[PDB]
């Protein structure tokens, strides 16, 4: 796709030479076909001079080389100064266009860790660890001794008071004040038949 | 498993092309075998240009290729989704989102927008990003706001990381950034308007991708801003964020919406302007808001109406738009003359 603009630039040169001629209208496909003919004529010059100045062992095609090329390719060069009166003096030169840029970026992690490790070659760029390598997650140490046994004993106290509240509101209840179902609802007495088998039983 | 019959041109068309030069009265089998022969040479050359481009090693065939062809029991403890490495990379991401050095800022922004295949320092990242949004909405701090909103922008342009499944804890943080009460200081509400502009711009970047489905995007955000615009006795930050979000939805959106809201919001203008005794915070706020949304709404009716009869167009727009609407129409005519 991106090649095409030079070809349409040649089409602009075609339109410039038609303007110097003075055609008001044209046939578009014929115009572009003539443009193709023009670029093939350019390349025909280039092939001719290419294989022609390889007849020297050195390369560089000079002026008289191209003179003999164009006379070989059929042109009276004597009109070339006079056509200068038409060419660079009656048609305005069009300018080229090429908009190239190199954008900026930054992705700074901090990990290389192997510059030229064992396959040593100091022409590379190690990416990171943030993409290539990986690791392992255990993520739960929690080993704070006194804090641990605080957790356990506090939880034991919780289960104490929980079962206390449960059988507090469950069974026969007698209080400390009057009507403490909220604060202190002590379980009332069972008294049962055989005390010793119960109270002396590990 | 395959049959390659001869692609043979209809010989009557070939006689039409022939007798276009005016040759003779032609029999069929002549042109039939002619199409055969030319098809042989064409398909031979077609194999040949294939041999070209299967050593030039592209599967597309140009004109130039054929031009060169014409040279003829307790369970194990868990492990997170992260690595330790990439979660520390994530911590770098976060503290560069904090980052005072704008080089570190832009580094973070590029690192967001161009780490495709990351995908796994996704939602956890974005999730208590949104939680930090809520907490700093409470803290009411514009710097964290602009950092997170440009962060969401860079999230929106990292093309591989598809938003769909993880949309629905992000967009409400954006709209909470839109709505109200971004009040660091009362003389410093100025940057918050640009924050709302940038936010509604982000919503505009959202809306072009997701409302094909379930219409949470278009229908819910439009009706949100609709009934939000209906909400009387609200601070004008709400009004600005609503109308700016509707502005970012598009030309025809505003063509629907600010067709009655032209003169209805002009009634809101001259309720504000030539209005109260003194509340200059709200006066200057709502005044520049109305001015901004006026000349930002202006290209719709500029594209809609021709720029004639500015005295009548002010009557067609409740006066207060005139001639700032007419000045914006002059600016639009200048922008058209730039073309």
Residue of B nearest to A105 (CA): B110
Instruction: Tell me whether residues A137 and B111 touch, CB distance under 8 A.
Output: no
Distance of CA A84 to the CA centre of its chain: 52
Interior angle at CA A126, CA A123 and CA A132, nearest 5: 150
**Is the sign of the CA dihedral A8, A10, A13, A19 positive or negative?**
negative
Q: What's the Cα-to-Cα distance from B306 to each of A92, B302, B303, B332, rounded to whole Å?
A: 39, 7, 7, 11
> Resolution in angstroms for this experimental structure?
4.5
**Is the sign of the CA dihedral A172, A178, A183, A186 positive or negative?**
negative
Interior angle at CA B57, CA B56 and CA B61, nearest 5: 80
Residue that is written with structure tokens 């509400």 in the block: B189
**Is the sign of the CA dihedral B219, B221, B226, B228 positive or negative?**
positive
What value does the CA radius of gyration of chain A take, rounded to a whole number of Å? 50
The region, left, alpha or beta by phi > 0 then psi within -120 to 50, assigned to residue B175 is alpha
Residues pairing with A187 in the sheet: A173
Cα distance between residue B228 and residue B313, in whole Å: 28
Supply φ then ψ for residue A173, to 5 degrees: -120, 125
Distance of CA B83 to the CA centre of its chain: 34
Q: What is the DSSP string of B315-327?
A: HTTTTTSTTHHHH
The region, left, alpha or beta by phi > 0 then psi within -120 to 50, assigned to residue B15 is alpha
Residue that is written with structure tokens 């939602």 in the block: B123
Experimental method: cryo-EM
| C-beta atoms surrounding A21 within 10 Å | 7
Mention every residue, 6+ apart, whose C-beta is less than 8 A from residue A138. Answer: B77, B79
A64 SS3 class: helix
Cα distance between residue B163 and residue B119, in whole Å: 10
- Count of A–B CB contacts within 8 Å? 52
Cα distance between residue B312 and residue B94, in whole Å: 55
Instruction: Tell me whether residues A133 and B92 touch, CB distance under 8 A.
Output: no
Beta carbons of B161 and B116 less than 8 angstroms apart:
yes
Distance of CA B102 to the CA centre of its chain: 25
| C-beta atoms surrounding A120 within 10 Å | 7
Cα distance between residue B238 and residue B196, in whole Å: 10
Instruction: Tell me whether residues A135 and B84 touch, CB distance under 8 A.
Output: yes
- CA nearest to B221, candidates B194, B202, B235: B202
Residue that is written with structure tokens 């014409």 in the block: B70
Mutation site for B-interface testing, chosen from A135, A140, A141 by largest number of B Cβ within 10 Å: A135
Instruction: Tell me whether residues B115 and A138 touch, CB distance under 8 A.
Output: no
Cα distance between residue A62 and residue A83, in whole Å: 21
Mention every residue, 6+ apart, whose C-beta is less than 8 A from residue A103. Answer: none
Instruction: Tell me whether residues A106 and B115 touch, CB distance under 8 A.
Output: no
Cα distance between residue B90 and residue B125, in whole Å: 8
Interior angle at CA B278, CA B274 and CA B280, nearest 5: 90
Cα distance between residue B95 and residue B105, in whole Å: 9
Instruction: Tell me whether residues B85 and A136 touch, CB distance under 8 A.
Output: no
Which of A105, A107, A133 minimises the CB distance to B85? Answer: A133
Which of B78, B84, B92 minimises the CB distance to A109? Answer: B92
Residue of A nearest to B107 (CA): A106
The region, left, alpha or beta by phi > 0 then psi within -120 to 50, assigned to residue B319 is left
Q: Looking at chain A, how many residues does it have?
A: 202
CA dihedral of B164, B166, B171, B173, whole degrees rounded to 10: -170
Residues pairing with A173 in the sheet: A187
Beta carbons of B70 and B40 less than 8 angstroms apart:
no
How buried is B252 (Cβ within 10 angstroms: 0-12 exposed, 13-18 middle, 19+ buried)?
exposed
Residue that is written with structure tokens 């209840």 in the block: A173
Q: Which residues of chain B make contact with A135, given a CB cutoff of 8 A?
A: 83-86
| DSSP E strand boundaries for chain B | none
Summary count for chain B: helices (H), strands (E): 15, 0
Beta carbons of B327 and B278 less than 8 angstroms apart:
no
**Tokens (6 digits) for B155:** 């999230």
Interior angle at CA A111, CA A105 and CA A114, nearest 5: 120
**Tokens (6 digits) for B45:** 């050359």
Instruction: Tell me whether residues B84 and A130 touch, CB distance under 8 A.
Output: no
Cα distance between residue B34 and residue B41, in whole Å: 11
- CA nearest to B193, candidates B241, B231, B148: B241
Residue of B nearest to A110 (CA): B89
What value does the CA radius of gyration of chain B take, rounded to a whole number of Å? 32
Beta carbons of A47 and A35 less than 8 angstroms apart:
no
Q: What is the CB-side half-sphere exposure of residue B67 using CA atoms within 13 A?
A: 6
Cα distance between residue B266 and residue B11, in whole Å: 74
Check residue B219 and report its DSSP letter: I
Cα distance between residue B261 and residue B242, in whole Å: 13
Q: Which residues of chain B make contact with A128, given a CB cutoff of 8 A?
A: 89
The region, left, alpha or beta by phi > 0 then psi within -120 to 50, assigned to residue A24 is alpha
A173 SS3 class: strand
How buried is B60 (Cβ within 10 angstroms: 0-12 exposed, 13-18 middle, 19+ buried)?
exposed
- CA nearest to B205, candidates B260, B163, B254: B163
Instruction: Tell me whether residues B83 and A107 touch, CB distance under 8 A.
Output: no
Cα distance between residue A142 and residue A29, in whole Å: 81
Interior angle at CA A116, CA A113 and CA A120, nearest 5: 150
Check residue B76 and report its DSSP letter: P
The region, left, alpha or beta by phi > 0 then psi within -120 to 50, assigned to residue B57 is left
Q: What is the DSSP string of B6-71?
A: -----HHHHHHHHHTS------HHHHHHHHHHHHHHHHHHHHHHHHHHTTTT-SS--HHHHHHHT-
Q: Which of residues 70-109 of B touch A (CB under 8 A)?
A: 77-80, 82-86, 89, 92, 103-104, 106-107
Residue that is written with structure tokens 């208590």 in the block: B128
Cα distance between residue B225 and residue A86, in whole Å: 67
Q: Which of residues 110-129 of B touch A (CB under 8 A)?
A: 110-111, 114-115, 117
């Amino acid at each position: 796709n991106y090649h095409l603009a030079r070809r349409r630039t040649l089409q602009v040169v075609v339109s410039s030479l038609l303007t110097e001629a003075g055609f008001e209208s044209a046939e578009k496909a014929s115009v572009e076909t003539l443009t193709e003919m023009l670029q093939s004529y350019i390349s025909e010059i280039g092939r001719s001079a290419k294989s022609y100045c390889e007849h020297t062992a050195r390369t560089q095609p000079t002026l008289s080389d191209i003179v003999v090329t164009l006379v070989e390719m059929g042109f009276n060069v004597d009109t070339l100064p006079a056509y200068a009166k038409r060419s660079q003096r009656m048609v305005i030169t069009x300018x080229x266009x090429x908009x190239x840029x190199x954008x900026x970026x930054x992705x700074x992690x901090x990990x290389x860790x192997x510059x030229x490790x064992x396959x040593x070659x100091x022409x590379x760029x190690x990416x990171x660890x943030x993409x290539x390598x990986x690791x392992x997650x255990x993520x739960x140490x929690x080993x704070x001794y006194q804090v641990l046994r605080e957790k356990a004993a506090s939880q034991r106290r919780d289960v104490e008071r929980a079962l206390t509240r449960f059988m507090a509101k469950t069974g026969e209840t007698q209080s400390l004040f009057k009507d403490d179902v909220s604060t202190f609802p002590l379980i009332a007495a069972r008294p049962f038949t055989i005390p010793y088998l119960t109270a002396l039983l590990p | 498993k395959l049959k390659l019959s001869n692609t043979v041109l209809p010989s009557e068309s070939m006689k039409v092309v022939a007798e276009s030069m005016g040759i003779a009265q032609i029999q069929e089998e002549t042109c039939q075998l002619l199409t055969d022969e030319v098809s042989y040479r064409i398909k031979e050359i077609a194999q040949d240009a294939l041999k070209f481009m299967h050593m030039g090693k592209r599967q597309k065939l140009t004109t130039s290729d054929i031009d060169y062809a014409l040279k003829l029991x307790x369970x194990x403890x868990x492990x997170x989704x992260x690595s330790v490495e990439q979660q520390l990379y994530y911590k770098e991401i976060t503290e560069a989102c904090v980052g005072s050095c704008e080089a570190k800022r832009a580094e973070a922004l590029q690192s967001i927008a161009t780490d495709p295949g990351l995908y796994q320092m996704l939602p956890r990242f974005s999730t208590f990003i949104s939680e930090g949004v809520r907490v700093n909405v409470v803290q009411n701090n514009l710097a964290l706001l602009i950092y997170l909103m440009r962060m969401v922008k860079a999230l929106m342009d990292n093309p591989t990381l598809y938003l769909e499944k993880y949309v629905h804890e992000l967009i409400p943080a954006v709209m909470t950034c839109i709505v109200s009460r971004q009040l660091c200081l009362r003389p410093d509400v100025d940057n918050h308007w640009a924050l709302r502009d940038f936010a509604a711009r982000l919503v505009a970047q959202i809306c072009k991708h997701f409302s094909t489905t379930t219409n949470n995007i278009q229908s819910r955000i439009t009706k949100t801003f609709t009934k939000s615009w209906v909400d009387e006795k609200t601070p004008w930050t709400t009004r600005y964020g609503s109308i700016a979000g509707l502005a970012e939805l598009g030309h025809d959106v505003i063509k629907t919406l600010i067709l009655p809201r032209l003169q209805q919001e002009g009634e809101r203008i001259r309720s504000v302007l030539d209005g109260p005794v003194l509340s200059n915070i709200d006066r200057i706020g709502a005044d520049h808001v109305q001015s901004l949304l006026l000349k930002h709404c202006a290209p719709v009716l500029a594209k809609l109406r021709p720029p004639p009869d500015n005295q009548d167009a002010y009557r067609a727009e409740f006066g207060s738009l005139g001639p700032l609407l007419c000045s914006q129409v002059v600016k639009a005519r200048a922008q058209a003359a730039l073309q």
